[PDB]
Amino acid sequence: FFSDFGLMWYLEELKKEEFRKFKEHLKQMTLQLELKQIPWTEVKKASREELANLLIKHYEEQQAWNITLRIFQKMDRKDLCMKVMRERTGY
Ligand SMILES: [Cl-]
Numbered sequence: 001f002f003s004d005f006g007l008m009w010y011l012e013e014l015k016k017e018e019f020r021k022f023k024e025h026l027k028q029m030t031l032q033l034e035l036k037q038i039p040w041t042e043v044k045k046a047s048r049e050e051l052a053n054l055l056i057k058h059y060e061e062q063q064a065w066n067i068t069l070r071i072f073q074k075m076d077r078k079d080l081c082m083k084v085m086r087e088r089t090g091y
Pocket of ligand 1: 015016019
């Protein structure tokens with residue numbers, strides 16, 4: 001999908017189960033590092049575009065990305081982390 005941008009495009013790099021696991025990691029971590037929480041029901045049901053917007057709405061843009069990239073590295077989606085980094089760097 002060359003139609004999509006930003007965080008949403010990355011969440012679309014995740015398959016069905018990965019996305020499902022992504023949401024479980026997100027909720028764990030937000031709890032672990034003690035941020036204001038999103039209701040687990042909202043998180044669980046969210047589409048990729050909706051979750052991307054939930055993240056940015058609750059944590060603003062930079063933190064939504066940093067949180068998302070931490071989860072990727074944790075889920076063994078290190079390719080996504082390096083991809084974003086090669087881009088943001090100019091490599
Ligand atoms: Cl899906």
